[PDB]
Design an enzyme around this catalytic site. Sequence first.
Site, short mmCIF file in Angstrom:
data_model
loop_
_atom_site.label_atom_id
_atom_site.label_comp_id
_atom_site.label_asym_id
_atom_site.label_seq_id
_atom_site.Cartn_x
_atom_site.Cartn_y
_atom_site.Cartn_z
N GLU A 236 0.81 -1.24 0.00
CA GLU A 236 0.00 0.00 0.00
C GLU A 236 0.84 1.28 0.00
OE1 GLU A 236 -3.16 0.66 -0.38
OE2 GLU A 236 -4.28 -1.08 0.25
N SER A 238 4.14 1.74 -1.09
CA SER A 238 4.99 1.85 -2.30
C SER A 238 4.09 2.05 -3.52
CB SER A 238 5.88 0.64 -2.43
OG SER A 238 6.89 0.65 -1.40
N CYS A 345 9.18 3.32 10.83
CA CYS A 345 8.82 2.35 9.77
C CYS A 345 9.80 1.16 9.72
CB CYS A 345 8.99 2.97 8.42
SG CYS A 345 8.47 1.90 7.07
N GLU A 354 12.68 0.29 -3.47
CA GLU A 354 11.61 0.22 -4.49
C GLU A 354 11.44 1.57 -5.19
OE1 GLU A 354 9.02 -3.40 -2.34
OE2 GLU A 354 8.09 -1.46 -2.63
C1 HEM Z 1 7.45 4.88 1.03
C2 HEM Z 1 7.14 3.86 1.74
C3 HEM Z 1 6.67 4.00 3.15
C4 HEM Z 1 6.30 5.07 3.91
C5 HEM Z 1 6.29 6.51 3.38
C6 HEM Z 1 5.96 4.57 5.24
C7 HEM Z 1 5.59 5.38 6.37
C8 HEM Z 1 5.45 4.89 7.64
C9 HEM Z 1 5.29 5.67 8.78
C10 HEM Z 1 5.10 7.17 8.84
C11 HEM Z 1 5.22 4.88 9.83
C12 HEM Z 1 5.02 5.29 11.29
C13 HEM Z 1 3.58 5.23 11.81
C14 HEM Z 1 3.50 5.73 13.25
O1 HEM Z 1 4.43 5.65 14.05
O2 HEM Z 1 2.44 6.28 13.69
C15 HEM Z 1 5.36 3.53 9.31
C16 HEM Z 1 5.25 2.39 10.10
C17 HEM Z 1 5.22 1.09 9.54
N1 HEM Z 1 5.57 0.75 8.26
FE1 HEM Z 1 6.10 1.95 6.83
N2 HEM Z 1 6.18 3.25 5.26
C18 HEM Z 1 6.60 2.83 4.03
C19 HEM Z 1 6.95 1.59 3.57
C20 HEM Z 1 6.75 0.40 4.23
C21 HEM Z 1 7.05 -0.88 3.72
C22 HEM Z 1 7.61 -1.24 2.31
C23 HEM Z 1 6.64 -1.72 4.73
C24 HEM Z 1 6.72 -3.18 4.87
C25 HEM Z 1 7.42 -3.94 4.09
C26 HEM Z 1 6.17 -0.95 5.85
C27 HEM Z 1 5.71 -1.44 7.07
C28 HEM Z 1 5.46 -0.60 8.20
C29 HEM Z 1 4.99 -1.16 9.46
C30 HEM Z 1 4.76 -2.64 9.82
C31 HEM Z 1 4.86 -0.11 10.32
C32 HEM Z 1 4.48 -0.21 11.80
C33 HEM Z 1 5.74 -0.29 12.68
C34 HEM Z 1 5.54 -0.37 14.15
O3 HEM Z 1 4.44 -0.04 14.66
O4 HEM Z 1 6.49 -0.75 14.88
N3 HEM Z 1 6.27 0.37 5.48
N4 HEM Z 1 5.50 3.56 7.96
#
Ligand code: HEM
Length: 396
Positions: A236, A238, A345, A354
């Site tokens: 979602e 990427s 993240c 990616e």
């Molecule tokens: C451009 C790509 C991405 C953006 C801009 C993005 C942005 C974010 C942000 C802002 C958070 C923090 C949310 C918070 O603390 O309230 C987050 C958490 C997370 N993201 Fe990403 N993300 C990206 C890509 C990905 C990818 C490729 C994956 C998995 C393969 C991923 C898995 C997660 C997960 C599991 C969390 C929760 C982490 C936790 O609670 O410990 N994200 N993301």
Amino acid sequence: DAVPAYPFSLPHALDLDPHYAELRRDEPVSRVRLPYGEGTAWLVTRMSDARIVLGDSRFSTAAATDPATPRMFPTPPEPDWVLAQDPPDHTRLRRLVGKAFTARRVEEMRPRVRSLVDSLLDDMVAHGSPADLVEFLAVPFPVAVICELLGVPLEDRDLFRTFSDAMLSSTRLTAAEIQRVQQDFMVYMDGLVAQRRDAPTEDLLGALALATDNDDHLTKGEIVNMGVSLLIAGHETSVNQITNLVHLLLTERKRYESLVADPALVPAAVEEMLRYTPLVSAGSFVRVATEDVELSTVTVRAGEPCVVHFASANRDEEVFDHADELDFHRERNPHIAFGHGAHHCIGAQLGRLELQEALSALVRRFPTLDLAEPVAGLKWKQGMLIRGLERQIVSW
Ligand code: HEM
Ligand SMILES: CC[C@H]1OC(=O)[C@H](C)[C@@H](O)[C@H](C)[C@@H](O)[C@@H](C)C[C@@H](C)C(=O)[C@H](C)[C@@H](O)[C@H]1C
Ligand code: NA
Ligand code: NA
């Protein structure tokens, strides 16, 4: 009652509501009413305050599982959600899978990833100009990568994409529609994890199955939900951000030309467009103060909830010069497009790779790339917690 509704407005493209700059200058911490739960929340709009709310044990996401806590999305958080865990319990959960997502392990992926991008861009040239970059690149690319990394079957794509879109509903669906999808996704992922019981696999779902049977301090719910979160997030973010970065490049086409000329600038440009883009349409998962915490202009009391706008903190003029302008040549770029602190993240390095490989590939092989549909007619996703394009017709 008397505090303003947040979000402040239905979103337009990747525009920030003008009210965030006003708040950053004059009321950087302000009371809002969120669309769900009860009471008010402090909206945090500056980088300094955002790093305190995201980065401090006095701010608890576990406290947000109370259904009365304000939130951006219809269903109350559950204790098993990765976002709803506080350290040190959260630290143990992220070690279940952290090893696969280290910068080093992600860097080992770049060859497979570049081959996937090339193959999919060959399918788009075979089809011929004009073509829908969503159909040919933005969807199939991240879906293939997350499927290979987790060990999720590629033929399940339509199944898990419709689950993932519902769970990222802001206003599109009701609490009952989303709760039903959350149940189905949990049972589906619990199913994939269970297939490894007497048949172990060399993938993240195999790591999750071993944790289910041998690990004593992680509940099955926590493990399964981790598998749900990785599969949602891994496609979602990427999928949407490829459309967002290409939107930004082609609507001020100098930007695209700047990278056609110097393709070695793509990594820096990816970092700059991550800063500039509200992928998260508004707000954040909520943190509740467990003790009084001093922010720039207010002391948040024990029990008061806070919500951050990542994209506002990323436009802070005390942090970034000409914050309102896209600049692929900034010397420093300490953005929080990937968050901060405990819930930083997990996929940050995979999202970076990616976007680097999709963009580098287009800028090299499609020097004549243009938007082949009117800007006014662009199908922006409505009613979701994140922004991106349902379709992006391009010409070369
Ligand atoms: C451009 C790509 C991405 C953006 C801009 C993005 C942005 C974010 C942000 C802002 C958070 C923090 C949310 C918070 O603390 O309230 C987050 C958490 C997370 N993201 Fe990403 N993300 C990206 C890509 C990905 C990818 C490729 C994956 C998995 C393969 C991923 C898995 C997660 C997960 C599991 C969390 C929760 C982490 C936790 O609670 O410990 N994200 N993301
Ligand atoms: C209020 C906006 C936030 O949405 C939520 O909290 C959602 C209910 C999350 O549960 C979604 C469904 C999870 O799958 C996340 C793991 C996705 C990952 C990419 C993020 O953390 C993401 C930035 C997220 O926090 C925001 C969209
Ligand atoms: Na936190
Ligand atoms: Na917003």
